Symmetry: C2
Subunit: 407 residues, 2 copies
């Protein structure tokens, strides 16, 4: 036998498992459409150079990389955001702003799972917190669409600008801010900061432990950018009607080098699962890639695995069996030609329909119809045919119907 | 600057290019649904062992393979069919037959494009030619759905059983039939496999026969291939796609595993490579170690040649992005109210933007036009006090909040 298991850490999606994935992706797509985002895609294979950010990120530590037969350093993308930036930088002046782009790429890692799908939503060319508002509202909308409520989940919201000011007031070089964020994201965090380069660590921990925006304002001032932006953010989400879904949490920084402003992450209010989604503003990324002009950006990722766990726990993922509208059944093999004419008609009318492909008895054909979840069984028999009719039997007992009135 | 071009032989899909791909995939999905096929997927990364068929196939010659950190021989799949067989073999007795499965995997090669998407449709557990009929009809349906006619395209149909009999009558070992097919798909190479001149003569003669009647004269009217091809053409005629299909004795396909009927789509102007290709492969699962033979048939249908053909025929106009509503705050003090409006529009199943940054109404209106909005909803202080907004159709007057949706 060949090996029937998939390659290490990768998932197969037979029809049953595919329907669950599809149910999830339908929401991601529908939510994107509702919010006016445009789909894009790019190759899963990118140059390794795209991910060399040198901040000790977990994501760059766990890259699935390899050398081509030809000697080029490539990787299966660990995330989509750098691919987006490449595309954005490639368009340059021709890209009309603002742009709202989304995708549902498979992303990879090498360390149980080595592979996941990740819905990406990003807004490009919008300076103000309305971008973050929309992004956060989109993530809530998706969760709501899947059956979750604000009692089940929330989004923790913070700004990295608070921590920046604290770090900056200690005379810490600006090039050290990203590593600090990668570290603070994680008693070992006390040791790692010293290595980057005690009273400064004290200050960091104190501010991240502050439990409200008012307490942040006491420390850095009420007119500080972070305070004004967070207040605007919460005012807008309230106005949109999702105030119960969002809250402030000063310990949220995220693990990625490139966030500059507001950052956020989704969570289950039972404290059972890892983050459902995560994102933030990254206004400097395109400048680091070499854009001659700064390009504001903000966005999030939303993985396909944790959400499914949460939906299973909450009993929101019942198996939806396969369905088809009609199953056409030839009474015997001499009726196959006529049955195919019927099948054609049903499909021309926009119906989903099978025809019994092999030779079998009517009752077995009827059973197969039930197994594939047919709403209706269409028996094509000699006597009915002469009368310009077929027999129809609803499965969701039996009578003749004219060919013209089936559809 | 970082490199803005994609990795060698790979395509970017910015929104414009993505809409074209989406238009194509919508047809593949809709056709699958119409025909009652179920979606599946599997990892793009598979074990290299999965593709070692030893017939000198072009597909196994051009594998995108590499060694993991850990020393495992893996590959980016060159095709989906072996992944399907793996899944099928994994299920074994638990899989209810017949099964009709489809997918739209990206597949890879290393040699020019190194990457394409390929719609796969396969029928499992059906012995008779009705499987091939449905598969061929599904491919025609997809092309028809995209705007093509039987004047633009067709499907050439043959059976490998004819060539099998000829090869077999020359005393050629059964294990040589797949290599012979891989070669005939493309004089010197057959001799190397082990065939003398008279056997090559016979091969070429039969592949040059232009009708099923001429095949019957050579191998008999009772021969499996003749009965099956006649049944096949009778069924496609009955389904109403007779103008789309024809017999061509030179069609064998390049893959090792086809055993019976094979087919391929083509443009009737002779400009393009094959649009799609498939056939019956009844032995594949036996070779993977299935304790019982499992009949299978299917096809692949790439995303690149079809698009070329559709561009030539002028069937791929750019469809610009569209959204139903663009909500415009008169100024920043109206943003909260505008968000309440935005919420309502989206709750009602409408696609809607709100102007995110600070800008003047006329510029907001321009942006609305650029993103292809059907309707612009201006949220101004004076209208708001009256429980109203201003609505302007794009593709001006006051409207009550309740009657927008
Ligand atoms: N790339 C981020 C998510 C993101 C998308 N856009 C902005 N941020 C992550 O994987 O965590
Ligand atoms: N694997 C074949 C297509 C196919 C799918 N199923 C059967 N055949 C190809 O790439 O040509
Ligand atoms: N964001 C968590 C996560 C990242 C990568 C993979 Br692969 C799986 C999960
Ligand atoms: N079926 C032709 C083809 C095969 C592989 C790639 Br990649 C592209 C086209």
């Amino acid at each position: 036998m060949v090996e029937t298991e998939p390659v290490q850490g990768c998932r197969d999606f037979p029809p049953e498992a595919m329907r669950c994935r599809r149910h999830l992706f339908d929401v991601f797509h529908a939510t994107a459409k509702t919010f006016g985002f445009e789909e894009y895609d790019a190759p899963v294979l990118e140059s390794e150079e795209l991910y060399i950010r040198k901040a000790g990120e977990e994501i760059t530590e766990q890259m699935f990389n390899f050398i081509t037969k030809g000697g080029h350093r490539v990787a299966l993308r660990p995330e989509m955001t750098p691919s987006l930036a490449r595309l954005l930088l490639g368009k340059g002046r021709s890209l009309l702003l603002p742009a709202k782009w989304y995708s549902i790429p498979q992303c990879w890692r090498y360390e149980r799972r080595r592979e996941h799908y990740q819905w990406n939503m990003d807004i490009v060319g919008v300076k103000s917190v309305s971008a973050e508002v929309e992004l956060v509202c989109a993530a809530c909308w998706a969760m709501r669409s899947l059956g979750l409520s604000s009692k089940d989940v929330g989004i923790k919201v913070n700004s990295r600008k608070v921590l920046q000011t604290v770090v900056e007031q200690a005379g810490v070089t600006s090039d050290k801010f990203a590593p600090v964020c990668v570290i603070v994201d994680k008693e070992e965090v006390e040791a790692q900061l010293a290595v980057l380069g005690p009273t400064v660590v004290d200050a960091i921990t104190t501010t991240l432990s502050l439990k409200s925006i008012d307490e942040i304002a006491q420390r850095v001032g009420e007119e500080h950018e972070a305070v004004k932006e967070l207040r605007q953010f919460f005012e807008q989400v309230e106005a949109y009607g999702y105030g119960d879904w969002v809250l402030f949490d000063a310990s949220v920084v995220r693990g990625l080098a490139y966030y500059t402003g507001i950052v956020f992450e989704g969570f289950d209010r039972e404290g059972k699962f890892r983050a459902l989604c995560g994102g933030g503003r990254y206004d400097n990324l395109l400048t680091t890639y070499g854009s001659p002009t700064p390009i504001p950006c903000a966005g999030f990722g939303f993985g396909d695995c944790v959400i499914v766990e949460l939906l299973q726990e909450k009993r929101l993922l019942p198996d939806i069996p396969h369905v088809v509208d009609d199953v056409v059944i030839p009474f015997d093999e001499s009726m196959r030609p006529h049955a195919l004419a019927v099948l054609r008609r049903l499909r021309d009318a926009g119906r989903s329909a099978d025809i019994i492909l092999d030779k079998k008895k009517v009752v077995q054909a009827f059973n197969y119809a039930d197994r594939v979840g047919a709403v209706r069984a269409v028996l094509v028999a000699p006597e009915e045919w002469e009368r310009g009719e077929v027999q129809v039997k609803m499965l969701r007992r039996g009578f003749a119907v004219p060919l013209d009135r089936l559809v």
